[PDB]
């Protein structure tokens, strides 16, 4: 889809979905677009992953509009099916917010992936 | 075609050998070569207006029976000479009455529950125990606990039974040396 800005390549999307899988094991992600926007409102999201695969993409491209207000990083991955597999549910997942923590075991991996995200903004 | 009662008697012993309706009655008496005589009854129809088109299938009513194979072991259940335990090659333990043949009853093989709460093994398609080599009944504590101890063909444990309940018991005694049970006894 053309209007899904920054889209990740294969290596970045592989490490994004790896940190999504370990955040899902640590119960540190909110899966789903409404839960992602709730974490955006409350300011407890590290970065937002979205799927450039939903057949209306306009059900997504509104949380960019309040990501750029709270300067939280956001990124697109090409498959909602693969994002749902990574989040560890049985359904496709359209968006997922990795929530904030300061005692987290995967804090360094979250920070590395979010720096690689904000390089391409 | 109203209904089919399948395997009403054994094919190997002749199938259903004589079946007859008692006349004027919805009950039919069958008998087969497997030493068995049954009755089946037709209940009245479940539809209160149609009836003739909704025919309830025949259900089972009383039956008498014995061993279908010659018995392999024999014991007397008590000192009064009233009941006698009798095991056959068709893998059934009957308790036959010497006083009144209606009191003859097959000892049931419906197993109890496991004592700890684990699962019991065995096949899902339940078959009868291997045919009985030996048995020993001692009704000093009868009704209290297990009462008959029996030993089957080419298997390494001896089952118990309760003559009061007329059913199997909770215990199967192992031999603990990977050998088949050649004899059983029990104290008085």
């Amino acid at each position: 889809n053309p209007k899904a800005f920054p889209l990740a390549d294969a290596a970045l999307t592989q490490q994004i979905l790896d940190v999504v899988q370990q955040a899902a094991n640590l119960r540190q992600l909110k899966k789903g677009a409404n839960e992602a926007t709730k974490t955006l409102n409350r300011g407890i999201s590290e970065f937002i992953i979205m799927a450039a695969d939903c057949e209306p993409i306009e059900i997504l491209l509104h949380l960019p509009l309040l990501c750029e207000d709270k300067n939280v990083p956001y990124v697109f991955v090409p498959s909602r099916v693969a994002l749902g597999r990574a989040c560890g549910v049985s359904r496709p997942v359209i968006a997922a917010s990795i929530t904030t923590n300061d005692a987290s075991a995967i804090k360094t991996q979250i920070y590395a992936v979010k720096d690689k995200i904000e390089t391409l903004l | 075609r109203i209904h089919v009662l399948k395997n009403i008697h054994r094919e190997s012993y002749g199938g259903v050998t004589q079946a007859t309706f008692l006349n004027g009655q919805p009950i039919i008496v069958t008998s087969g070569g497997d030493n068995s005589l049954k009755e089946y009854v037709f209940d009245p129809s479940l539809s209160q207006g149609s009836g003739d088109v909704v025919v309830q299938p025949p259900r089972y009513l009383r039956s008498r029976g014995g061993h279908s194979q010659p018995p392999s072991y024999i014991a007397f259940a008590d000192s009064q000479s009233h009941f006698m335990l009798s095991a056959s090659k068709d893998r059934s333990l009957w308790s036959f009455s010497l006083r009144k043949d209606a009191q003859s009853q097959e000892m049931s093989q419906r197993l109890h529950k496991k004592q700890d709460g684990g699962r019991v093994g065995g096949s899902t398609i339940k078959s009868k125990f291997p045919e009985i080599v030996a048995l020993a009944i001692e009704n000093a504590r009868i009704g209290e606990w297990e009462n008959i101890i029996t030993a089957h063909k080419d298997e390494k444990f001896a089952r118990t039974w309760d003559m009061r309940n007329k059913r199997v018991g909770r215990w199967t005694f192992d031999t603990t040396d990977d050998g088949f049970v050649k004899s059983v006894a029990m104290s008085q």
Binding site: - | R1, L46, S47, Q48, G49, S50, V53, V54, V55, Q56
Partner: protein
């Protein structure tokens, strides 16, 4: 048994006799129009005269109610009491009531039938005497207040046991309750006898056929995971499919087509049962929508057929019957449809039956197997019996151009069948 049980039996026998004023009030306040306080004060003359008005309206809508005005709605029936004549007069008027109910089952959306069968409810007590036929006749209308009304005033039969939490309730029975009602076997035998009387007296209407077929295919769907229930269920629904195919209605014929197609895709039936099913399908095929459903039904019933013997030549009688109901243009056109039905095994059996039984129409089998694509075993059996056709009769241009098609695609396979039987140079010397 006990004394209270035997007395409950004598109460159920004497349910309709009014033995004092209080039982007469409780028994006459059961109306289908009015509430209890009006219905208890009404007379027989009042309810008879407006039921006779409504029967004149119902008779000018549909003229088969005039004989009910002659017997069931006459003025001798104001004084006719039900439980004072013998069993033979009772069975006479109860098949009169059954005739009225399965005639007026279709009319239940218009108030003259409500005001007319009001008199059967209040004079002849058909809500408690003739109650199974009343429920079975108005079973289609279960989302409607008229079925709510007959459930409120009905005394429920023992086969209709699952509706016992929807009597005197404000909410209609649901569709899952209807499938739980139909899921019984004795209820299925009862409903198929009801449909047999419907098909016999030619009263099957399309809303009934839709409801009946919906509940039947939901019964098959519910029992789709236990083969012993499906096997209990086969000679009931295939018998009612035969009795729906043995009538004249295009609607009831394609109702039977729906039942047959769902049942054959639910379990693998026998080959001979499927062939006799297609014989019963073709033996009364007269409509056009019935022809559309019949071709789709025969295609799916041959598709759901496995094992050694799925794609034989269908025999001479059934093939020439299928020819007399469906010629070449119909089969070729239906294959040329862009929706692409799955007609693999049936079309293979059809072309093999042409090669064993027609031996003139081979250009058409070239065109139709140019149209649709088949599998390797299908075209292997086709070219094997074409090889046998070449060896029995002299090989002209239609068989030659068929082998040119079987050379232009998959020539390795026709080489494999010739090497399994024959030779390529010997076959080219043959043709």
């Amino acid at each position: 048994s006990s004394l209270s049980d035997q007395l409950a039996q004598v109460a159920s026998n004497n349910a309709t006799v009014a033995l004092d004023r209080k039982r007469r009030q409780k028994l006459h306040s059961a109306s289908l129009i009015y509430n209890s306080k009006t219905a208890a004060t009404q007379d027989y003359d009042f309810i008879f005269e407006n039921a006779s008005k409504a029967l004149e309206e119902l008779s000018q809508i549909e003229p088969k109610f005039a004989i009910f005005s002659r017997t069931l709605f006459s003025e001798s029936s104001i004084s006719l009491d039900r439980n004072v004549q013998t069993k033979e007069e009772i069975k006479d008027l109860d098949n009169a009531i059954n005739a009225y109910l399965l005639l007026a089952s279709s009319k239940w959306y218009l108030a003259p039938t409500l005001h007319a069968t009001e008199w059967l409810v209040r004079r002849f007590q058909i809500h408690v005497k003739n109650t199974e036929m009343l429920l079975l006749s108005t079973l289609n209308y279960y989302q409607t207040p008229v079925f709510k009304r007959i459930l409120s005033i009905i005394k429920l039969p023992p086969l209709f046991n699952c509706l016992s939490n929807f009597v005197r309730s404000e909410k209609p029975p649901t569709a899952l309750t209807m499938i739980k009602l139909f899921n019984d076997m004795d209820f299925l035998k009862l409903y198929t006898s009801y449909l047999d009387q419907c098909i016999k007296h030619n009263a099957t209407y399309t809303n009934q056929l839709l409801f009946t077929t919906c509940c039947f295919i939901n019964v098959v769907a519910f029992n789709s995971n236990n083969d012993e229930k499906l096997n209990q269920l086969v000679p009931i629904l295939l018998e009612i499919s035969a009795k729906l195919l043995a009538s004249k209605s295009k609607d009831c014929q394609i109702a039977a087509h729906t039942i047959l197609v769902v049942f054959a895709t639910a379990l693998p039936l026998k080959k001979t049962i499927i062939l006799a099913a297609m014989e019963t399908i073709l033996s009364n095929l007269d409509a056009k929508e019935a022809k559309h459903s019949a071709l789709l039904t025969i295609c799916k019933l041959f598709q759901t057929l496995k094992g050694q013997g799925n794609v034989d030549q269908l025999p001479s009688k059934i093939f020439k019957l299928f020819d007399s109901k469906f010629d070449t243009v119909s089969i070729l056109t239906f294959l040329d449809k862009e929706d692409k039905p799955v007609c693999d095994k049936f079309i293979t059996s059809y072309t093999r039956s042409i090669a064993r039984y027609d031996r003139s129409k081979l250009n058409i089998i070239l065109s139709l197997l140019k149209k649709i694509r088949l599998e390797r075993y299908e075209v292997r059996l086709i070219i094997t019996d074409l090889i046998y056709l070449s060896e029995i009769l002299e090989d002209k241009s239609q068989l030659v151009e068929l082998f040119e098609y079987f050379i232009s695609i998959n020539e390795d396979l026709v080489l494999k069948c010739l090497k399994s039987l024959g030779l390529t140079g010997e076959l080219f010397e043959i043709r």
